[PDB]
Every structure is written in C-alpha cells, then in structure tokens.
Amino acid sequence: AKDAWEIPRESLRLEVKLGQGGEVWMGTWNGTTRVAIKTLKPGTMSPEAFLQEAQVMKKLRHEKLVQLYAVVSEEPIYIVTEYMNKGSLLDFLKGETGKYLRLPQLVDMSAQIASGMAYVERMNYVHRDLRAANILVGENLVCKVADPIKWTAPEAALYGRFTIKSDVWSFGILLTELTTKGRVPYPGMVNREVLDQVERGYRMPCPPECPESLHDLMCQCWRKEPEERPTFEYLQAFLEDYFTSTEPQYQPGENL
Ligand SMILES: COc1cccc(-c2cn(-c3ccc(CN4CCC(O)CC4)cc3)c3ncnc(N)c23)c1
C-alpha cells in the first residue's frame, strides 16, 4: 500500500544527467516543475535500502534540507526532490566561483548547514555522512543538507556509535572544507594515519587566514568526548552572529 508521496512514473521525464555512484538526473514533474530524480541501477542495493533515504526525507521538512517531492516506490525506483541548480557544495567550492568566496560567504554557508542540522538535531535524527559533497547549493548561495573516515568521529568510525554529536564532529571537518575552498581534510594523510593520529590527540591546525575563533570552534567540534561537543543549535547561533559577536574587526585577506 502506497502513501500520499507516491506518483505515477509517467509523470516524470528524466532530461539531463547530473551524476552517478544508481544515478541522479535533472528533469520535469507533471506540467512545469523542475525536479531532481535519483535512480536505482538494478542490483546495487535493495528496494528497502534505497527507500531508507526517501522514508527519512518524508519525515524531515526544513528550508535547509533538500525537499522530497515524490517517490516511485516500485521498480525502477525513483526519488524526487527540488532541484539544486548549483550542485554539490564540494564542486562549488573547488569550482570557478569557489575561488571568489570569502569568509563572510563561507560562514553564512556554514550557518545554513548548521540550521538544517539543528533541525535534524531537534527531530532526534542522525545524518551519518555530513560533508561538503552531501551539501547542495542553489540560487543565492542557499545550502541544503542532502543524502568517509576523515569526516567521521573516532567513536563512530571505530565502534559504530553514530549520534548527533558525531555529526558535530563531521561539521567541524566540513568547516575545514569551507575554509580551504574544498581541500581534502588531513592533507597528505591516508585513512590509517588519520585514525592513528586523531586517536593520539592530533587535530588539523588553523587553515591559512582562518581566524583563530573559527578554528577554536572546529576544535570544540572535535572534542574526544562526544558530550563535550557543541550542539548544532549553538553552532547555528555562533555562525549566524559571527561577524558582530565574534569577529567584529574581520578584514578580507588574500583568500578569506
Ligand atoms: C532524489 O533526489 C536527490 C536526493 C539527494 C541528492 C540529490 C542531488 C544530487 N545532486 C548532485 C549534485 C552534484 C553532483 C556532482 N558530481 C560529483 C562530483 C564531480 O566529479 C562532478 C559530478 C552530482 C549529483 C543534485 N544536483 C541538483 N539537485 C539535486 N537534488 C541533487 C537528489
């Protein structure tokens, strides 16, 4: 028995291909509604498993989470959502526009992600794979949460203990992506080195031109003890108010 998210497949025209991993397409829904469509390439994972993402997307509704529109829950299975016309944050950061972003833009992007994740937090959910590649960018630099040892808290990577606090860890790592225009965290380190070093207390240093106040925040996100890590509610307020309350004398530099 289907729910009120169900639509007939015939209402979808998959136009322009965007990515693969099944796939994701640009497309149209009913009359004149531009959407994104996730496909399941037969075999790779079970229907139930591909319909994890949709089922959670059904209960999560917020301005800074990518919005589910519809689902075709019989094969070939499709998930349908709003279309994010600037694609992934990671690609945006690394792209041609990426280099013009300065700290005011990057922090605002972080504030928006924190807000979506603050909502995930209030709803008692856990994301598990929070990072720039899973943030989508739209018009007016809107960032939405959608959808990785280097991004994963140690307790989670080692013991499968994923909580909102391990999401906070990942958010700290995401701040390094933002402040380096999308560089891979722990430059030159393989996953084993990162595990080994993090366990001995190593944390990434302050990125070049990143204000110390922003790095301290990263460090708080990376506290060994999950419960000592800030809430997203806290992160959202800090990042929202950053240039008044925290760094009121910020001046542009070469890159940030
Ligand atoms: C069911 O609908 C969903 C659910 C979850 C995510 C997406 C999604 C993914 N993308 C997407 C964005 C960027 C890329 C970029 N890509 C990977 C790295 C790079 O090499 C270039 C190609 C691929 C897919 C979207 N773009 C625009 N709009 C989207 N909704 C997406 C859609």
UniProtKB/Swiss-Prot annotation:
Processing and modification events after translation: Dephosphorylated at Tyr-250 by PTPRJ. Phosphorylated on Tyr-250 by c-Src kinase (CSK). The phosphorylated form is termed pp60c-src. S-nitrosylation is important for activation of its kinase activity.
Tissue specificity as recorded in UniProt: Expressed ubiquitously. Expressed in the skin (at protein level). Platelets, neurons and osteoclasts express 5-fold to 200-fold higher levels than most other tissues.
Connected disease: SRC kinase activity has been shown to be increased in several tumor tissues and tumor cell lines such as colon carcinoma cells.
Note: May be involved in blister formation in Pemphigus vulgaris, phosphorylated-SRC is abundant at blister sites but not in normally adherent tissue, which corresponds with loss and disruption of CDH1 in cells adjacent to blisters. Phosphorylated SRC is increasingly abundant at pre-lesional sites of blister formation and occurs prior to changes in abundance of CDH1 and DSG3.
Active-site annotation: D129
Family from the record: Belongs to the protein kinase superfamily. Tyr protein kinase family. SRC subfamily.
Chain positions recorded as ATP binding sites: L18, G19, Q20, G21, G22, E23, V24, K38
Self-association state and partner proteins as the record states: Part of a complex comprised of PTPRA, BCAR1, BCAR3 (via SH2 domain) and SRC; the formation of the complex is dependent on integrin mediated-tyrosine phosphorylation of PTPRA. Interacts with DDEF1/ASAP1; via the SH3 domain. Interacts with CCPG1. Identified in a complex containing FGFR4, NCAM1, CDH2, PLCG1, FRS2, SRC, SHC1, GAP43 and CTTN. Interacts with ERBB2, STAT1 and PNN. Interacts with DDR1, DDR2 and DAB2. Interacts with CDCP1, TGFB1I1 and TOM1L2. Interacts with the cytoplasmic domain of MUC1, phosphorylates it and increases binding of MUC1 with beta-catenin. (Microbial infection) Interacts with HEV ORF3 protein; via the SH3 domain.
UniProt domain Protein kinase: residue ranges: 12-243
Function noted in UniProt: Non-receptor protein tyrosine kinase which is activated following engagement of many different classes of cellular receptors including immune response receptors, integrins and other adhesion receptors, receptor protein tyrosine kinases, G protein-coupled receptors as well as cytokine receptors. Participates in signaling pathways that control a diverse spectrum of biological activities including gene transcription, immune response, cell adhesion, cell cycle progression, apoptosis, migration, and transformation.
Name of this protein: Proto-oncogene tyrosine-protein kinase Src
Domain of life: Eukaryota
Subcellular location: Cell membrane; Mitochondrion inner membrane; Nucleus; Cytoplasm, Cytoskeleton
Free-text note regarding domains: The SH2 and SH3 domains are important for the intramolecular and intermolecular interactions that regulate catalytic activity, localization, and substrate recruitment.
Organism of provenance: Homo sapiens
